[PDB]
Amino acid sequence: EVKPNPLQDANLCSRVFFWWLNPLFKIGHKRRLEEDDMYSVLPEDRSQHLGEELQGFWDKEVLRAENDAQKPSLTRAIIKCYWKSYLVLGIFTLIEESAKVIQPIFLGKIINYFENYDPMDSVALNTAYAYATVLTFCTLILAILHHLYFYHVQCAGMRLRVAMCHMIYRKALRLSNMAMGKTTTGQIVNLLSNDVNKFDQVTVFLHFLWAGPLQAIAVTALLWMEIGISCLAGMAVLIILLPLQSCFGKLFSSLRSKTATFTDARIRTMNEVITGIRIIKMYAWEKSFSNLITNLRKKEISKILRSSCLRGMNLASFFSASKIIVFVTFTTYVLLGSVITASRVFVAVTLYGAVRLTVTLFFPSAIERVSEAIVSIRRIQTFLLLDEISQRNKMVHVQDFTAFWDKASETPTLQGLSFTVRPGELLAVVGPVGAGKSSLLSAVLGELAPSHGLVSVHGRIAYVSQQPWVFSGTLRSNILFGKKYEKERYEKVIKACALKKDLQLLEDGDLTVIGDRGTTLSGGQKARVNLARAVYQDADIYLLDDPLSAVDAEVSRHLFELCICQILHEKITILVTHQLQYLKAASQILILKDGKMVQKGTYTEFVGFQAYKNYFRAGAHWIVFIFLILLNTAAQVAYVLQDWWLSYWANKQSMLNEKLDLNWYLGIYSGLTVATVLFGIARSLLVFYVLVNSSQTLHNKMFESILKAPVLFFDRNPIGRILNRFSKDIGHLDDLLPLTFLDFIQTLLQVVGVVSVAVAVIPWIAIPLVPLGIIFIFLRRYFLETSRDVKRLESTTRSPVFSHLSSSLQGLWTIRAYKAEERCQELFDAHQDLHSEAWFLFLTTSRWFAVRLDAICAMFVIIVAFGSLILAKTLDAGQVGLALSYALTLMGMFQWCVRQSAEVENMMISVERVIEYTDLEKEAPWEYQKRPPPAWPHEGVIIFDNVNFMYSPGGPLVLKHLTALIKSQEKVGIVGRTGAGKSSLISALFRLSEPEGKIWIDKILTTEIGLHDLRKKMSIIPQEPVLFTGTMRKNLDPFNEHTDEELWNALQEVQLKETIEDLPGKMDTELAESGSNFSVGQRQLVCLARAILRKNQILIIDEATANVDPRTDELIQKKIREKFAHCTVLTIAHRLNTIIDSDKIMVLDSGRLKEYDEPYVLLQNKESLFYKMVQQLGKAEAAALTETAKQVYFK
Ligand SMILES: CC[C@@]1(O)C(=O)OCc2c1cc1n(c2=O)Cc2cc3c(CN(C)C)c(O)ccc3nc2-1
């Protein structure tokens, strides 16, 4: 075994404590870990073994189902597989529940000793030590041996999950093409990504389905023997809490899906902002999108906050549920007239303290997780019952072949086809079009079957689809594609593929790892690899579907004239290519149409504290948190004082020889119950409000930072990187972190409850508390330095599994062509177990930590129990019963406290990323001092003086010293080399980066006005037109300052009015995604309509009409020159004929003004680049251009 696994040989008292895992933490404390530091899985965890074993039952089970004439049952099959195993772990669950319930009874007798106390009876004292001893071992069961057990219940989960990933993939290769036609990859990948993943989460709780109810019965029976019928009072109320928890579960799922619509509506609208940002800014339409995102968020926040109230009240039930069921029990019990006594109260408090989790949380969860598992199985069953291809599947013969992609009602995909070919001969095929162009090959592969006629083949087939496909590994590994390596074969074919030079020049040699999803190769080179793979296999049958042979290249000739015509030509081969002239070398040509063989037409026939501060300060004044800190303690102190008051009552009562004032004691006691639920519920609402209001603020402080971010921000940051923060992180700050934080705080108080009660009742506990503390601090620090990293490795090692299935599910034909399932199965198993190696660490890592938290927690109970008995002269029965009833309660809650601590610390990083967006360097203000006068653009005069511009500070100067005059209403065409200068002068004109030099517009220096004062007052028509998901009215005027008449005129200025007024909303029609119902030219016509609405005296055309039919461009040209006669127009355009009649042209290259004059005068200088560019037209049209330019003198 490559990575020997210590679990093979660790002794019991190693693996009980996971002591064997110690070396991992040592190294993980010294280093960052890597995939070689993780252990290999034990033999039985191998995907192949589990799958082959489970098939060994599911196979039998479908045999039964056919023989019994019923639909089969996968749930029975896994059960029949795991029954003989999984029952054994039930035995520990049984003894575990016993320990949970037995502890109270002996907590009775150890308290009972104090009720009978005399300092001088050693015999009674020794009995108490025996009870205290068994109380320790009972704790030791729950606190130590529980952890090995829980790991094995987790292993039932992981073992079951892995086996399904095997059987699914095994099915996926056997899957019939029809079933693949009835399927999408996303279904199988999701099934593997999620729906099998549920099998861990059922198995942790499946034993609670019986052990929980059996627990509840036992607790009621015991209590009845302690407190009579009165135990029915609490237990019935406890059981009523079970539906009530479900009632909350129902509601927020409703409101969660109700909020889903708005995060989707927000995130789509946000994605338009982030991707569209540049053109958004030029229009000055921030305020439009600012209103949308604000209103959706303010809508979203209202429902998520209204859900947050119910989510808060839910935890308040978990806070009061012990206190309510205690109160009603003893109140009834007292009203049936019993005195209250320390022994009989704390037993019930402890029995309730034990059962409460089982009925209120584990069992409610379990019935849900079982329900999600059983639905997961039934779809997996559905998948495993899809149809399959017939798995059995020197010469090739075909005869009258009549076949379909599916037996739909249309005519067969192949019809009447017959041929035979023998080795040493090449067929070629003019195949179908609009359909399976290589359908003939697909028949030879047996992807299709005859309704009539026959195909017969012998030997082994090589195939390539015209679609390329590349396997996970190196390119050499793809050239091997699992076959043995053979240097001379490999050399000869790889050289005959001319691949070495390209592979050396472009892909670093054959050792190059093929990257994620095949990223590494160019598609042109990727295509050739398929043939290189094919030829390396030296198969009997070589089937070629157009390998971009249609692409003219020396290799696409060389492969044929040397390799395919001479080397490969000995083998059986069939070729489809557009290279019809290659088929002059073909031995035979088949031409096909409508599946018919139409002719044998042979060719000759032709995180630091500051994060917390920032997050909380964003919620409220610190004065509010002071009010909040009061409520926390008030809830917690009300909680403890209730149980202390119950002790105090018992202590007074047992002192009497005479009546108690029932309505004093029960009065105050009832008060603390009402108080503890009321502060508890109030606290639980307040925390959410403070934190959720904090999330709302961070979004709005952050969202404004995004609109006012300069374009430079969106150059450096990918769209996904930004948009993820608006989906994921602010998702968490609404969905889950306020919840997780309140649950952390709630539990932390309760731990502070037990510890502080314990030191109060027994002061000298305060000494050993500090050792336990410092032990915990070093433990947490030592642990999390590793666990943080294992979770990284686990999350990483997941991604090859889905990638491999996706790649393999894309390659199905090819895999079965090489009948290579026997290996590709092994590749999946290699990936699956390597993830399982990480999952095995993830399970056992947490236990090695969790067992110590329960170790030091187990040590605490010892301290209180024997500490109480040591101080027996001083303590008194009520106070001990308080201390011990709390001490037992620590066991469960303390582990949960630190789990949420780790999860909050991890999740809190989402807040750091959000705040890092709250302070991005802004542009200058939109509105600024020295506002331009009320009609400032009144001439369209522009000066550029020594203008210098860059896409980054200190970057390359893409404008150098650019200096120009543009006169009023002048029409300035601009052109240059492709990619030279480009829009940079436009982005300078919008100040999207601040230019050096000066730009003056209508006597105003552009660098001394607000960016909306500028950008509102100049139109642009962009390189790519943009529509926004919204009304046609908003896409034309979000401010609705233009009349519908003007909006109709604009749509009537273009052709499109009578294509929009017939849409049901008319101007108010909101569009499909990206306006798919409109053509690209029509989207530019929308920008022209926008421009026609704006009627600014300045317009910029950015090369737009290259997307558009010239006849629509002709309309654009017409309407520009008609409508913008008074306007000043700048026009970057590639084809000079669009601009040949400009009053002047600027030509830019290398960032310099190569030319600026009347275009004919530029042509009149035969040295000019403009003349040269017109001469580079290479055509007599240069004369028509020249004449048209000269006419500008005279027309
Ligand atoms: C749901 C997770 C889990 O089942 C688990 O994976 O392992 C076992 C375990 C769990 C949860 C909780 N606990 C556990 O031991 C203890 C616990 C206490 C909780 C408390 C405090 N209790 C004293 C009521 C809460 O307020 C809210 C949620 C709580 N959840 C849990």
JSON list of C-alpha atoms and ligand atoms in Angstrom, two decimals, residues 205 356 361 743 746 892 896, ligand 1:
[
{"chain": "A", "resi": 205, "resn": "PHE", "atom": "CA", "xyz": [-29.11, 9.45, 12.63]},
{"chain": "A", "resi": 356, "resn": "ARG", "atom": "CA", "xyz": [-34.82, 16.63, 25.38]},
{"chain": "A", "resi": 361, "resn": "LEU", "atom": "CA", "xyz": [-33.56, 17.57, 17.64]},
{"chain": "A", "resi": 743, "resn": "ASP", "atom": "CA", "xyz": [-26.44, 29.71, 18.06]},
{"chain": "A", "resi": 746, "resn": "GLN", "atom": "CA", "xyz": [-26.58, 30.88, 22.99]},
{"chain": "A", "resi": 892, "resn": "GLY", "atom": "CA", "xyz": [-23.41, 17.49, 24.89]},
{"chain": "A", "resi": 896, "resn": "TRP", "atom": "CA", "xyz": [-21.49, 21.79, 19.93]},
{"chain": "B", "resi": 1, "resn": "LIG", "atom": "C1", "xyz": [-27.15, 18.35, 14.08]},
{"chain": "B", "resi": 1, "resn": "LIG", "atom": "C2", "xyz": [-25.69, 17.90, 14.31]},
{"chain": "B", "resi": 1, "resn": "LIG", "atom": "C3", "xyz": [-25.38, 16.79, 15.40]},
{"chain": "B", "resi": 1, "resn": "LIG", "atom": "O1", "xyz": [-26.37, 15.83, 15.20]},
{"chain": "B", "resi": 1, "resn": "LIG", "atom": "C4", "xyz": [-24.04, 16.03, 15.05]},
{"chain": "B", "resi": 1, "resn": "LIG", "atom": "O2", "xyz": [-23.51, 15.88, 13.98]},
{"chain": "B", "resi": 1, "resn": "LIG", "atom": "O3", "xyz": [-23.39, 15.38, 16.08]},
{"chain": "B", "resi": 1, "resn": "LIG", "atom": "C5", "xyz": [-24.08, 15.22, 17.32]},
{"chain": "B", "resi": 1, "resn": "LIG", "atom": "C6", "xyz": [-24.76, 16.50, 17.76]},
{"chain": "B", "resi": 1, "resn": "LIG", "atom": "C7", "xyz": [-25.40, 17.27, 16.84]},
{"chain": "B", "resi": 1, "resn": "LIG", "atom": "C8", "xyz": [-26.06, 18.50, 17.22]},
{"chain": "B", "resi": 1, "resn": "LIG", "atom": "C9", "xyz": [-26.10, 18.98, 18.53]},
{"chain": "B", "resi": 1, "resn": "LIG", "atom": "N1", "xyz": [-25.47, 18.24, 19.49]},
{"chain": "B", "resi": 1, "resn": "LIG", "atom": "C10", "xyz": [-24.76, 16.97, 19.19]},
{"chain": "B", "resi": 1, "resn": "LIG", "atom": "O4", "xyz": [-24.23, 16.35, 20.08]},
{"chain": "B", "resi": 1, "resn": "LIG", "atom": "C11", "xyz": [-25.64, 18.95, 20.84]},
{"chain": "B", "resi": 1, "resn": "LIG", "atom": "C12", "xyz": [-26.42, 20.24, 20.54]},
{"chain": "B", "resi": 1, "resn": "LIG", "atom": "C13", "xyz": [-26.88, 21.31, 21.28]},
{"chain": "B", "resi": 1, "resn": "LIG", "atom": "C14", "xyz": [-27.62, 22.45, 20.75]},
{"chain": "B", "resi": 1, "resn": "LIG", "atom": "C15", "xyz": [-28.11, 23.61, 21.47]},
{"chain": "B", "resi": 1, "resn": "LIG", "atom": "C16", "xyz": [-27.90, 23.72, 22.99]},
{"chain": "B", "resi": 1, "resn": "LIG", "atom": "N2", "xyz": [-28.50, 22.52, 23.67]},
{"chain": "B", "resi": 1, "resn": "LIG", "atom": "C17", "xyz": [-28.15, 22.44, 25.12]},
{"chain": "B", "resi": 1, "resn": "LIG", "atom": "C18", "xyz": [-29.98, 22.61, 23.57]},
{"chain": "B", "resi": 1, "resn": "LIG", "atom": "C19", "xyz": [-28.81, 24.62, 20.81]},
{"chain": "B", "resi": 1, "resn": "LIG", "atom": "O5", "xyz": [-29.32, 25.74, 21.40]},
{"chain": "B", "resi": 1, "resn": "LIG", "atom": "C20", "xyz": [-29.03, 24.53, 19.38]},
{"chain": "B", "resi": 1, "resn": "LIG", "atom": "C21", "xyz": [-28.55, 23.44, 18.70]},
{"chain": "B", "resi": 1, "resn": "LIG", "atom": "C22", "xyz": [-27.82, 22.36, 19.34]},
{"chain": "B", "resi": 1, "resn": "LIG", "atom": "N3", "xyz": [-27.36, 21.26, 18.59]},
{"chain": "B", "resi": 1, "resn": "LIG", "atom": "C23", "xyz": [-26.71, 20.24, 19.14]}
]
